From Swiss-Prot:
Its EC number is 3.4.21.-. Disulfide bonds join C7-C136, C26-C42, C110-C210, C117-C182, C147-C161, C172-C197. Induction: By spinal cord injury. This effect is particularly prominent in macrophages, microglia and reactive astrocytes. The active site is at H41 (charge relay system), D85 (charge relay system), S176 (charge relay system). The lineage of its organism: Eukaryota, Metazoa, Chordata, Craniata, Vertebrata. This is Kallikrein-6. It is found in: Secreted; Nucleus, Nucleolus; Cytoplasm; Mitochondrion. It comes from Homo sapiens (Human). CDD domains: Tryp_SPc. The gene is KLK6. Belongs to the peptidase S1 family. Kallikrein subfamily.
Amino acid sequence: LVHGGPCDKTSHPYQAALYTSGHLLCGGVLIHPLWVLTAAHCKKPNLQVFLGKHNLGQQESSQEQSSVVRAVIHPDYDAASHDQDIMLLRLARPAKLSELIQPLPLERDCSAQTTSCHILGWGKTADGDFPDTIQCAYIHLVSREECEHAYPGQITQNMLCAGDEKYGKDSCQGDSGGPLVCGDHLRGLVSWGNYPCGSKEKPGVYTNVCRYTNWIQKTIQA
Ligand SMILES: N=C(N)c1ccc([C@@H]2Cc3ccccc3B(O)O2)cc1
């Protein structure tokens, strides 16, 4: 996350860290003791999910670990266009809940007009380095028209755009699958965006979670 700052250790209990080959690949969202919601482009071999983490460089008393039993990619995910970029991860071991491990409620209502959001993760910071401490930033939901102009013919109804014209607060490499939180509900998933990271002109693109209400439930019920 570029142009943000360290999160408060207690303000992100739903945050997941996804590892592959000994390094952080993506973020994720705990939405159920058995399920982490992430981006479909985060599918990599032998994913290890870490819950209750704040500082990646140190073993913490609150952290929990789990292998993936089943990675469920949306049937209509299109890798070339990033459309329907959502994946459900079934945890091998259900998450042991505490004050630092809790699921985030999803936004079911597509009509919701809360523009004031926040992003978080352990992705590349302004200096081009990967932080050990989780980063936060307040960003705003950009218009469909503004996004459509920034990325011609690449924005679908399954995508949301959020940024900050003021300082260019954006998600970055390593923040993918992570949350876009609006009104203490999951509004989006870090999907893709401008390179180098920065939303001063071209906003960050997020999977639009409200559209997947039915598929999520149907997957968890299976
Ligand atoms: N809004 C942006 N500027 C933005 C955010 C996240 C990404 C990557 C995409 C990715 C690809 C492959 C593996 C992981 C990721 B991810 O963590 O972030 C790229 C751009």
